[PDB]
Amino acid sequence: HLLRAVLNLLRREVSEHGRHLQQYFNLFVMYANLGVAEKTQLLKLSVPATFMLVSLDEGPGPPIKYQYAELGKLYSVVSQLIRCCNVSSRMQSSINGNPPLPNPFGDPNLSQPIMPIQQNVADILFVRTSYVKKII
């Protein structure tokens, strides 16, 4: 309920309050850093997909009116939540027949990936190229 209510602010309330978005997403940065059950809970809410959509507009509601919005904590949530996922489907080893190497850049202090990367998230990262340009 606490996460659902905070995510409901993303409908209309968030796209009114630039100058003030650092602490909104920092709530998710802090909550993710808690542990696996917390990161699992955020993923099951499809938080990265909605968060990835925002800052590309197209979100659950209106675009953010303040154009000078500091969304640095929005990316940090997406960066942390995605790194706790499996991208094993989308790797090729550049040598025909060779299996792809293991990924060392997943989340440390996490034994095994939480879940295979979600389809709606893979569409924004790999299928499309808008988000990668945004964070870069």
**Binding region for a second copy (CB under 8 A):** 57, 62-63, 65, 67, 94-97
Residue 114: both structure tokens together: 């939480």
Rounded least distance, CB 102 to a second copy, Å: 20
Q: What is the DSSP string of 62-125?
A: PPPS-SS---HHHHHHHHHHHHTSB-GGG---SSTTPPPPP-TTS-TT-SS-SSBPPHHHHIII
Rounded least distance, CB 34 to a second copy, Å: 34
Rounded least distance, CB 18 to a second copy, Å: 11
Residue 110: both structure tokens together: 């996490």
Nearer to a second copy, 96 or 111 (CB): 96
Rounded least distance, CB 83 to a second copy, Å: 29
Nearer to a second copy, 29 or 56 (CB): 56
> Considering only CA atoms, which of 58, 45, 55, 57 is closest in space to residue 118?
45
Query: Is residue 100 left, alpha or beta, with left meaning phi > 0 and alpha meaning psi from -120 to 50?
Result: beta
Nearer to a second copy, 35 or 63 (CB): 63
Nearer to a second copy, 94 or 112 (CB): 94
